[PDB]
From a paper:
The 20S proteasome (20S) facilitates turnover of most eukaryotic proteins. The enzymatic activity of this system is carried out by the 20S proteasome (20S), a cylindrical, complex composed of four stacked rings enclosing an axial channel. To be degraded, potential substrates must first diffuse through a pore at the center of the distal α-rings before encountering the peptidase sites within the inner β-rings. In turn, this barrier creates a key regulatory role for the proteasome activators (PAs), large particles that bind the 20S, open the gates, and facilitate substrate selection and entry.
Next, we genetically installed NLSYYT in place of the last six native residues of PA26 (PA26E102A-Opt5) to generate a PA that now bound the h20S (Kd = 360 ± 160 pM) and potently stimulated its activity (EC50 = 42.1 ± 1.2 nM) via its C-terminus. To probe how the binding of Opt5 activates h20S, we then determined the structure of the h20S-PA26E102A-Opt5 complex by cryo-EM to an overall resolution of 2.9 Å. The cryo-EM structure resolves a single particle of the PA26E102A-Opt5 heptamer bound to an α-ring of the h20S. At this site, the N-terminal extensions of the α-subunits were displaced from the central pore and the diameter of the pore was widened by 3.8 Å relative to the apo α-ring, reminiscent of other open gate structures. First, we confirmed that the disabled activation loop of PA26E102A-Opt5 does not interact with αPro17, suggesting that this structure allows the determination of termini-specific mechanisms, as intended. At the occupied α-pockets, most of the P2 and P3 Tyr side chains of Opt5 made H-bond contacts with residues located in the reverse turn between αPro17 and helix 0. Six of the seven α-pockets contained well-defined density corresponding to the termini of PA26E102A-Opt5. As previously predicted, the α7/α1-pocket (interfacing the α7 and α1 subunits) did not contain density for Opt5, likely because this pocket does not have a canonical Lys residue (α1 His68). Hence, we categorized the C-termini in the α2/α3, α3/α4, α4/α5, α5/α6 and α6/α7 pockets as binding in an anchored (A) state and the C-termini in the α1/α2-pocket as binding in the unanchored (U) state. The dihedral angles of the P2-P3 residues of the bound Opt5 form a β-strand structure for the A state but a right-handed α-helix for the U state.
Numbering used by the authors:
A (entry chain M): 1 to 213
B (entry chain E): 8 to 123, 133 to 241
C (entry chain G): 6 to 245
D (entry chain F): 4 to 241
E (entry chain A): 9 to 245
F (entry chain C): 8 to 251
G (entry chain D): 3 to 244
H (entry chain B): 7 to 233
Amino acid sequence: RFSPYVFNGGTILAIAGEDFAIVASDTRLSEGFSIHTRDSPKCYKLTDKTVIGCSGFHGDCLTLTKIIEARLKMYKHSNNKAMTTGAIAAMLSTILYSRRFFPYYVYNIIGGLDEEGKGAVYSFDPVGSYQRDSFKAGGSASAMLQPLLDNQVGFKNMQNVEHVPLSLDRAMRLVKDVFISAAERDVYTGDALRICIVTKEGIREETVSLRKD
Amino acid sequence: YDRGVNTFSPEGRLFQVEYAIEAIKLGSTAIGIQTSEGVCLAVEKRITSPLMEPSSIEKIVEIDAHIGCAMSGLIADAKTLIDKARVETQNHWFTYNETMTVESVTQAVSNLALQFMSRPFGVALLFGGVDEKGPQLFHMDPSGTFVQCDARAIGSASEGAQSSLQEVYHKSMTLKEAIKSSLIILKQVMEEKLNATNIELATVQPGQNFHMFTKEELEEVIKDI
Amino acid sequence: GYDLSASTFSPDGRVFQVEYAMKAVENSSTAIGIRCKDGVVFGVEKLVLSKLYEEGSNKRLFNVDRHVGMAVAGLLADARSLADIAREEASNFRSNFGYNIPLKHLADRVAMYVHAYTLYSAVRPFGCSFMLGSYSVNDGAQLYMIDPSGVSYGYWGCAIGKARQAAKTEIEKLQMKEMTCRDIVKEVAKIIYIVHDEVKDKAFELELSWVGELTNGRHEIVPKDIREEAEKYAKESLKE
Amino acid sequence: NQYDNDVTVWSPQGRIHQIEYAMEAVKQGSATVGLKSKTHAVLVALKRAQSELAAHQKKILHVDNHIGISIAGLTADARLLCNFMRQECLDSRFVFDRPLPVSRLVSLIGSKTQIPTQRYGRRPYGVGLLIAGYDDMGPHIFQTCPSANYFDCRAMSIGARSQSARTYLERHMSEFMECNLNELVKHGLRALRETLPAEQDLTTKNVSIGIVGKDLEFTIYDDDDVSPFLEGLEERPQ
Amino acid sequence: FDRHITIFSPEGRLYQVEYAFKAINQGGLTSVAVRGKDCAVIVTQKKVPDKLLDSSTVTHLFKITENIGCVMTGMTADSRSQVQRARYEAANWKYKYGYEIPVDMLCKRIADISQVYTQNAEMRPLGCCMILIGIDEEQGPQVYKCDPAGYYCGFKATAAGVKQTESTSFLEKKVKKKFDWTFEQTVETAITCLSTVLSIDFKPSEIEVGVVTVENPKFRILTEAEIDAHLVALAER
Amino acid sequence: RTTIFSPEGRLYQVEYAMEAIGHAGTCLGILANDGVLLAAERRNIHKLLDEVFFSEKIYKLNEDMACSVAGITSDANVLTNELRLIAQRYLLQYQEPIPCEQLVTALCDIKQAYTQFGGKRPFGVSLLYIGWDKHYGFQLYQSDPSGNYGGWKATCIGNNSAAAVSMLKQDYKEGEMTLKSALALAIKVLNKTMDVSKLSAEKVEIATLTRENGKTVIRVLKQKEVEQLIKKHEEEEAKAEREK
Amino acid sequence: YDRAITVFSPDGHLFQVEYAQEAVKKGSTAVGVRGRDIVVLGVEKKSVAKLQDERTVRKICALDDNVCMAFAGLTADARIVINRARVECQSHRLTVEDPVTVEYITRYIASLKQRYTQSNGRRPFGISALIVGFDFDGTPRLYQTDPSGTYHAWKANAIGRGAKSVREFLEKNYTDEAIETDDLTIKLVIKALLEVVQSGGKNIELAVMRRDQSLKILNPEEIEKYVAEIEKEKEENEKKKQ
Amino acid sequence: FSLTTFSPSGKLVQIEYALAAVAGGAPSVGIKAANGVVLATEKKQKSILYDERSVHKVEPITKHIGLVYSGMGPDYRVLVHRARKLAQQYYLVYQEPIPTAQLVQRVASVMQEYTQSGGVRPFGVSLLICGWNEGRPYLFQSDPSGAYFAWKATAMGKNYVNGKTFLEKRYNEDLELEDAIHTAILTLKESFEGQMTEDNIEVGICNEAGFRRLTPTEVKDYLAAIA
C-alpha cells in the first residue's frame, strides 16, 4: 500500500573554523538500487553568511528549502535586515516541529558565520532538536565520517599531540579525504563532491570528481 | 461625514480617526528623549486623591528588558496594545532566539490600528529601547503611523513641551542632562508642585535593562531644579 | 426616499437604482458590434485622456474564452470583474461537461449574476453594459448584449454608450447579413469615426476585435495592416 | 447632496460620490513621480516630516526583487496592500519558481479593491500607488486608483501639486526612452522640483529614490545615497 | 413610514408587496390563457422595437418540462430567475419522487418561494406574474397562475398585464354561454380577446402561441405559418 | 432600544417592559407556616370560553414548585419551558430536586441577557414562585423583567398591585399565618381590588402548596371549594357593618 | 458623534461609557477601608418593605476564601460579573495550583467590563466594585473598578449615592492613627456611612476579613455597640469639650 | 415600526397591526357540539373564471385534526405545512396521534418565533383548530402573538363581534353535529353579501370517525335550511 516516504540517498558534512565554514555534499540521487541522476547537490545558499545541507527524502528537501527562502524574505521585510545563522536555526527548529506527527524525513546541517565572524555549525534531527557543534556529518555515511573527524579535528584518543587549530587548506584536504573513502564502502555516496566555503569575503563553490561505481 | 469610520468627507478625510487623535490631549503629558548613552521617559501621573496608591497608575511600563513604553489616552486601548507588544516580543524570542527591535515592535503594534474591533484606538505610545542600532525612540499614533523621533512629547501640553524640546535638544547630549531638561519642561506645564509621587521616570541604557526610578533617585534630581 | 436601495419599489413598480446604473453607461464612450454572415466584429471608441498613458491601456475588449469576446461600456472595474466571472463560468462548464460553453448559455449565466445585484440592500447594481460575441461551425455567429438589469437579447447589430442612437441609425443601413468580416471592418471604423466628436472630448484610439471563419473560432485583435487600412477608409469617407 | 453617505448608492446622474471622495484622499499625500526608460524604471518621492525634530515619513516600499511602489494617500491602506502584494509574489515563487509579472499583480490589486466599491460595510481604499517593475516584457510603470481602476503609463505623478510634474513629464516623454539612468533620475527630480514652491528645494532629508532594471534589483536610496543623483541639477532661478 | 420596508400598517396591509404588482405593467405587454375540454392555450404579444434584434431571442413563452409550459409577464430579468427555479424544482421533484411534477404543485412551490420574500427582509419580491399550463392524468387540462405575494389558484381563463380587467370582462362574458369548447374555439377566443383589448389587427409576427392538448401533452410553441391558419378564419366570421 | 443608556443612567425599554404588566391579570402569593399559596384572577371571562385545562395561569414546574405569571403570555410559555428544563437538568446532574432559589437565579440570568445583547426584546413578564426545599422550607419569590428576584412573605403582581400590597401591609400577621388565614386574606385582597364586583368563583384561580408524610403536594381548589371561601367573606364584612 | 453610539466625539469622548458611570452614581453607598490585618467594607441597606426576606438582598459577596466584593449600580449585572469571577477564582487554581490574588481577579473583572465597551450590540456593565481581600505574604489589598475597565488601588474609597461626600470625610480622617486596632478601622467605616445614612444603625451592614478568619458579616448586636460607642465619643468631644 | 421595541404604555404595536390583518379577512365560524366540531368559512371568488376546486380554506392536518383561518392564505400555507410536520414528529416519537392541545402549543411556538427577531414580520392569520381526542371534542384559536384560547364557539374575520353575539344568543350545549352546522351557516349568513351557494362556502367537521371536508352536495343539502 501507499507509503509516503522513500530514501533518496545523500551525504552531507560541515566543519567550522575561526574565520570560515565549509558545507559539503555528494551529488548522487538514488531510488532503491537505481540511480536517478549524478548532478543533484544537497547544498543551498541562503544568505551571504549562511549555507544549509539537506539529505533524506527529496520531496521534503525541496519543500523545506522553499519554505526557508520564503521566510527569509518575510524577515527582511518586517525587520529590514538579513537573518543570522542562529535565527535561521531556531526558525527551522519550529518549522520542523510544525510536522511532529508527519515529519520531514530530512537530515539538516547549517553552516555559516557567527556575529563576530567565527564559524558556526548547527545539526538537526527530523523534528527540530538542534545543537551547535564544530563538525558534524549527516546522511547515509554519517556513521563512517564522524570517527575520523573526532580523531583528526578533536584529537581524541591521541596523546602528546599538537592541538593546532584547523586552517582552511587542511580542512579542505580532510573533507576530500573522507568522501574519497566513503565512496569506497557506501553505495549511495557517488559521483561528485560539492564544497561550499563560507568566508567574510563571500561564498565559493568547488566541484571534485568521485568514482561513478 | 463626522460619525462612522467608513465614510469619506468631500475632501477625503476620516473625522472619527481625527477625533481619536483628539482623545490623546485629554491624557497627561509624556516626554521621550534619545541620547547615545540611552533613552529617558518622563510623565505626569495626575493623582486625583491622596487615598489612591499612585503605583496603581501604570503610565510607564516594561515591554521587555530592553524596551519600555509610555502612553497617553484611553486605559483600555493601552492595556490591549501593551499586551500585544509583550506577546510579540516573546513570540520573536521563541522563534528566532533574539531581541526584537523597537522599530519592529512598533510596526507590529501599529498593525492593530489597521483593523476596522470597530473603533480607532484612542491612545498614542512612545517606545524607548536599545537595539543593535543603539538607543531608539519611536512614536505610534491611532492611525497606525509610526516614525523614529529624537525627542517627542505627547498628551495635554504636547505643543509647549515640543516647542521647548526643539531649543534644549542637540545631538550631543548626555543622559543626566536630558533627564534634567525633561523635568524642567515638565515643571512648566503643571499647576501642581512637582514631587516624587506626581511623576514617573525610566531609562534604558545599552549595558543596563529597563529601570524605573525610585523615590530616592527621583528626589535626588528634583533637588537640583 | 424611494430611490436609495434596490430592495425598494416605488408606488408604480419601478426600481430607480437599476435605472441610475444605466445612466452611468449612457455617459461612457461608445462601443458597437455587428454580426456578419461568417463572424462578428467589435469596435470601441477608446478615449486617451492623457498622453502619458501607453498605447494599450484601459483595454475595453476582453477575451473570455478561446471562442468568445467581450466589449464593455460603463464603469471599467465593474467590467473587469464581470469578465473574470464570465471566465470562470466558461471554465467550470468545460470542467463539468467537457466542451466549449455556448453563448446563449454564458449570456444567461452572467445575466443572472448581474440580476442578483438588483435585489439587495447591501449591494448596488452593476454600472456596465456589455456585448458578447462568438462563432462556431454548429452554433454559427452570435451576438448578445447584457444590461445592468440582467436582460439579455440577441442582435444583428448593437451599440452601447453615448452615441447609441447615432450608431444604430448607421448600422441599420448596413446589409450585414450579406457581407463578410473584412468588409464590415470598414463599416465599423466608419461608424466610430462618424459618431466621435472632437470638440466634446480629445483625441481617441480605435480598438477592434474579430471572431469568425478567418480566425477559426478564435477571438483575436485585428492586425495592424487591416486596422490602418480601415482607419484610412474612415478618413476618406468623412468627406460627406 | 444626499446620495453621498454610502458607496452602494447611485445618483440620478449615474455616479458614486464616495469613490470620487476617496480619490480626493490621494491629493492629501506628498507628491511622487514615476518614469521609465527602455532599460530601467525609476520612482522618486518627496518625503514629509510631522515634527521638525523627527524622521521623514517613508514613501517607497520594497515588494520583491523586481517590483516596488511609491504611495500617496492613507498609510493604512498602503500597508495593507503592500502586504497583499508581498504574499501574492511569494505565492508565485513558491508554485512556479518565477517572478510574478506586474500586470498580473495590478490586475489582482484592482480585483481586490473593487469589492468595497460594491458591498456595504467596508471603506474604499483611499490610497494611490505608482508601481515600478521589471519582467520578461521590459520596464513598467503602473498607476493604481481608489476607483479600482489602473493604467499602464510612460510616466506619471500623483499627490499634492502633481500637475506641475505631469506638465513637465508630458513635454519630455520623447527623451526618456534612450536616456541613461542618471539623466532619467534627473528628469524625475526636476519634475518633482516643479511641485515645490520657489522657496523650497530638494534635499537629502526629503528625497527618496527607487530603481529597478535588468541587472539591478529594486534598491532604495534615502539620505546620503541620494547626493550622487542631486549633483548635476541646475540651480533654477524663478 | 409604513411603505418602505415590509412592515405592517395600521390597517393591516403590506404596501411593498402591492407595489410589486405594479411592476408587472412596466413591460407594457399583456398575456392571456384559456382552457378547453381537450386543450389549454397561452397567448402573448411579441413587440420588437428594433430591426437589429433577432426575433428568435425575444420571447416570453418558456418550456419548464416536456409537458408543462409557461408565459411570463412583468420585469424581464426577474422572469428568467423564476423560470430557472421552476425548472430546478420540476427536476428535483422527479429525482426524489419518481414522476413528473403537476402544475397544481409547481405553482404552489413557486408561491411558497415567493412568500418568504414578503416575510423576510433579505430580498425584494419579483415583479413578475406566471401562468402555467399542463395536462393532468385525471383532472384534465389545467391553467394556473401565481403572484408576487404567494397567491395561487386555478382558472378556466385569465390574463396578466396592462389589459387584464378589460380582458377578464371579455372572458367572463364568453365563458358563461358554455359552448362546446375545442382547440380552434379556444385559440380563436384568446386571439379575439387580445385583439379587442388592444385593437391591433394582429399579424403572425406580433404574437406567439403555446399550446398543450390531451392528444399531444407536449408543450409546443407555434410557428408563424400556423398562427396564420387561425388568423385567417377570424376575418371570415 | 435596550442597549442604550440615558444621560441620567436609565434603561427605558426595561421600564416599558415593567409597565407592560399592569395590563395583565392580578396574581398574589401568601406565605404561611403550614404552606404557601397563589391566587390569580381570570380575565378570560366569557360565556363561550371552555376552560378545558387543569389551570390557565398556575404552571407546575417540578414536584416541589409552581409559578404564576403576568404580562405577555407567549414570553410566559417560553419561560415556563425553560424553567422545567433547568429543573430536570439539575435533577439529571445531581438526582436531587433543585432548590427554589437556584431556579430563579437561572431564569433571571436569561432575562438579564436580553437587556444586554443587541437585537432582542426584554421579556415582558413578571413571575411569582412558590415551592419547598430542605434548606429554607416554604418560600415565595418575585421576578421582574430586568432580571431581579426577591424573596417575599406576601406580594402581588399585575393590575392594582400597589393596592393589594398596601392591604397586605395592613392585614398580614407574620408568625401567625395559617393557610385558612391566608385564603381568607386572599379572598379579601382579591375582592377589594377587582373592578368586577361580587368576586365570582369563575373569575379566580387558587393553588396551595403543603406537605403530607414527607411528600410535597400542589392542589388546585375546585369551584365548590372556593364558593365556601367566598360565602365566608360577605358574612365577615356584614358583621363589620352591623356595629353601626 | 453625539449620544446613542459608542463612536467618538470631537472632544475625544465616549458618552455611552460616562452614562454607565451615571448608573453607578444612582445605587446605594458602599465604602471600604484597608488596614494592617483587618479590612472593612460597609453598604447602605435598600429600604426594607415590611414583607420581604432580606436574605436575598446580598450586597456583599465572597468570591473565594481570601477575596471579597461589594458593588454599586445595577443589581442584575452584579450577579453575572460575580459568578463569572467566582468561576475564574477556581479555574485559576486549575491552571496553576496557587490561589488567586486580588489584582488578578480585579484585572479579570475589568477586562470583562472593557470587553462590553468595544462592540455595539453589547451594553456596558452598569456597576462598580470594591474588591477587598488578602494575599500570600498577608498584604491587605483594596481595589476599585468602574464600567470602563479601569482599576486602581486605594487606601479607602466609596461608590454610590454620596461617594462625593464620603471621599471628603476619608480625606479629612483617614490616617495611620485610625487603623491602630480593628475596632478603630470599623468605627471609621461606621462614621463614614453615617454621613449619608438614615441616622439609624439598622440601615448598615458591615463585613470584615482577617489574615486568619474567613469572611464574617456582622450582626446588629455589634453594630449597635460600635454605633453607641461612636455616639458617646462624639457627645463627649465635639460638644462637652468645645 | 420596530418589533423588538415596547411603547411607554407597554404595548407591542406590530402585533396589534398584524391582528388588524386578521380582522379584515373572510369570516370563519367555529362551534363545538357535544359529539363534534364544525368549521365553516366564506370562500367567494372575484369572477366566474376562478376554479374553486383547486384551493381550500379548510384543510386537514391529520385524520382527526383540521383547520380554518382568517387573513392571508400565503401565511396559512406555511402553518399548515408546519403543523403537518409537527404531528408527524410526535407520531414518530410516540407512535400515538398528536393531541389537539399539543399541536396548538407547538404551532403557537412557531407563531412566536416570528415575533422576536428583527427582519421578520408576524403572521397575518389567526387559526381555528378542531379535534377529537379522548372521547371529547376540542376547539382552539391561535393568534399571531403566540397566544391560544380554547372556545366553545367563536367567529373570526369581518364582523367578528356581531357574529359572536349571535352565537351567545343562539348556542347552547345538548346539541349535536347537525344542529350546529345550521347555526354556523346562519352565523355566516349575517355577513354574506349575496346568495349563498354550495361553492361560496366551505365546511369541515370532526367526530369519532375523524376530520372530513364536506362536499358541495352536502353543502347544498343543508343550504336549504335543512337540518
